Amino acid sequence: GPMAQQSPYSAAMAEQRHQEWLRFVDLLKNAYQNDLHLPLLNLMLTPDEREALGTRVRIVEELLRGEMSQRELKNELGAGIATITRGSNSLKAAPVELRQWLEEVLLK
Amino acid sequence: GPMAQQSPYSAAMAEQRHQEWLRFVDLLKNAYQNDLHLPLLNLMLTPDEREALGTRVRIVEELLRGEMSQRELKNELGAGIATITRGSNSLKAAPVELRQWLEEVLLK
């Protein structure tokens, strides 16, 4: 039995809600071009919904600075041990004349 | 006593929510220009909030066609009696030779 994936009612109401969302995105796009975006957003949204969107922008900003500041901390800490291992390896491969000279001038 | 119109806390939180709304409107404006509006709207809104905006566009459309269709009905009905009164006035001001001729050809 090849069962139908969805009903004809759900398929029609899915395309309807799809076209209604596209009409809104297109309506808001031309509003930004016709400089009517600010009054249109007041018609589409309540004052509380506008405050919610303004705070969500600050939420995703503080979430990005939270991930980025620790991403730079994970890279700065990881690169910190990289210069130490490079310093240890380059010190072993250094010639004897340079090594014994560094022990004399750096360690008095 | 010249009472202060609002508190310093309410004035600061009013400018904050004002700048957060402007940042959102500007963020969405550049998204439409950088062709990133569709993924940004999915980040800012839930699927239910997107369905709500898509239906509100159809609401304001059906509210406009409701007002417009009856506006045209109020104008078509008002202009209908205007042609009747013009027909009555123009018929009284018509000459006798035209009036008695219309009674002969239109009323057999």
- Residue B40's closest chain A neighbor by CA? A57
- Contact check, Cβ <8 Å, A17/B51: yes
Contact A34/B51 with Cβ under 8 angstroms?
A: no
Instruction: Give dist(CA B73, CA B50) in Å, integer.
Output: 35
Question: Is the CB of residue A65 less than 8 Å away from at least one CB of chain B?
Answer: no
Residues B46-67 as b/e (b if ≥16 CB within 10 A, e otherwise) read eeeebeebbeebeeeeeeeeee
Which are the contacts of A60, defined by CB distance < 8 A and separation ≥ 6? Answer: B43
Q: How far is A54 from chain B (nearest CA, A)?
A: 4
Domain boundaries of chain A, sorted by first residue:
63-108
Please name the residue of chain A whose CA is at the shortest distance from the CA of residue B52. Answer: A21
Question: For domain A63-108, is the CATH number 3.90.1280.10?
Answer: no
**φ and ψ at residue A4, rounded to 5 degrees:** -65, 135
Chain A residue numbers touching B32 (CB-CB < 8 A) = 28-29, 32
DSSP states of A62-107? HHHHHHHHHHHHHHHHHHHHHHHHHHHHHHHSS-HHHHHHHHHHT-
Residues A38, B25: C-beta atoms closer than 8 Å: yes
Q: How was this structure determined?
A: X-ray
Taking 3-state DSSP, the helix, strand and coil percentages for chain A, each rounded to the nearest 5, stand at: 85, 0, 15
**B53 close to A (CB below 8 A):** yes
Q: Distance between CA atoms of A89 and A74, rounded to whole angstroms?
A: 23
Question: Chain A within 8 Å of B95 (Cβ-Cβ)?
Answer: no
Specify the resolution in Å.
2.5
A54 with B20: CB under 8 angstroms?
Answer: yes
Q: Which two tokens stand for residue B12?
A: 């600061």
